[model samples]
Target: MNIFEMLRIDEGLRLKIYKDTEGYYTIGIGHLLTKSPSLNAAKSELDKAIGRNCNGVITKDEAEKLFNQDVDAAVRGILRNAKLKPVYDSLDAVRRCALINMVFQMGETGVAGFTNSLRMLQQKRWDEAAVNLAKSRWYNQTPNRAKRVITTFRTGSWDAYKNL
Candidate 1:
């Protein structure tokens, strides 16, 4: 499947504001309103995008818009990251999506911290890369998502996420 569809399943859809697993104020397909300059600014942007006072809710179309914007940003972030670019370029579509998925969840810098894992990925050492990824706090914090991602990396296929 494509990155968009995979992310739709992994992140899930939400029309209302809710605290994520880490208790951050999030909305619209894992969009972190808390990560904006301020919650007021974030809400204002959301309202502007949806063409009304959103209060605590957004339309599915509006959420899809936000999700696309977020995914674009994540893809760009990975491509521009010096250390990640080559490794990302070396991967196939499925593995590339796995890399983008990790960056989408934890930002480029956060994923970049996995030096050994990236190296292993670059070398086409799938098992080693998966092992390195499992050693992270990201894996510990979200084992289900991590497991799926790691399996994708290991198998170079989307089969791991098919059931989802």
Candidate 2:
């Protein structure tokens, strides 16, 4: 239930700068390039969507409040779509986290784009879902992290696999 846990589900505990898809400098979770205070404050309600201390320079805390609020709400939004009731009940937390993590990275609409993977999840085909995920651009774009999620998907373990 902690917001930090939700962010870590996808953002992977980043505390410094990394390149996003557009290749801009980003920090904390997914907070993109050189932020404007107004924009930060607006999403400050979500605190850059992962507790990034959304102030202009990222001194922190006020932004943590926003991140907390946003992550909590986001969990609801991520899981509130149609026909996920069985998953909501049957899957373990790690599995649920993977789905929400996809929402964090891919957006809800983009998450919906995973037809086979979603169906696999509904059918509890863990390995197929993992394979489906590994075949995607997101997997190629983030292999190290994707390995962890794929392991979770396939075996319900967050442990870093040997090959990973």
Candidate 3:
């Protein structure tokens, strides 16, 4: 199934996409994988810059540097220590970055709901986290994206988004 199909995306939610990446357009989770160069250009970008001008292109690195963005930054080109600090607890760099990926694509308010969602996660409140995830305008705006993302969280598998 397509990524949106897995996410159960709705008919609404005006998501913007580039349509073509080196002649291949229809992609899954492009929005989610904003940190990723399209499979076409990304591979070259990764091959060229990664490990040369930068470090390893692991999920955590790409999630923070590539896909998800902290839109709160002042300097457009700068990342990480831009301005608004990201908060995390107990989450490893990978899981923390995955959450960043979610927010980068979803936006500030989109990331805000996780105050309760993570509390649910900390409490092993699976249903609560799921429900809290659904409370988002993005969740309602996109059909099953909440389900897909929460499933990713539940699995605690960074590869889920990576495969996208």
Query: TM-score of each candidate?
Result: 0.92, 0.68, 0.42
Global lDDT of each model? 0.88, 0.61, 0.44
Worst 10 residues of 2 by lDDT: 33-42
Looking at model 1, residue 93 earns an lDDT score of 87
How accurate locally is residue 130 in candidate 1, as Cα lDDT from 0 to 100?
A: 87
> Would you give me the overall lDDT of model 2?
0.61
Query: What tens-digit string does per-residue lDDT give for candidate 3 at 91-151?
Result: 4444444454465445555455457676666566655667777776656755444555666
Worst 10 residues of 3 by lDDT: 6-15
Off by over 4 Å in 3: 1-87, 158-164
Tens-place lDDT digits, model 1, residues 1-164: 89999998889998987777887778889887765546676677667766889987988988999999999999999889998899999999889999999999999999999999999999999988888899989999999999999999999988987888
Ranking, lDDT, top scorer first: 1, 2, 3
Counting clashing residue pairs in each candidate, in order, gives 0, 0, 6
Better of 1 and 3 by TM-score: 1
Angstrom error at residue 52, model 2: 14
Quote the lDDT for 3 in model 3. Answer: 25
Indicate which candidate wins on TM-score: 1
Worst 10-residue lDDT window, candidate 1: 34-43
Candidate 2 TM-score, true structure as reference: 0.68
State the lDDT of candidate 2 residue by residue for 34-84, as single tens digits: 434444434454344545554434435533544555566556766676644
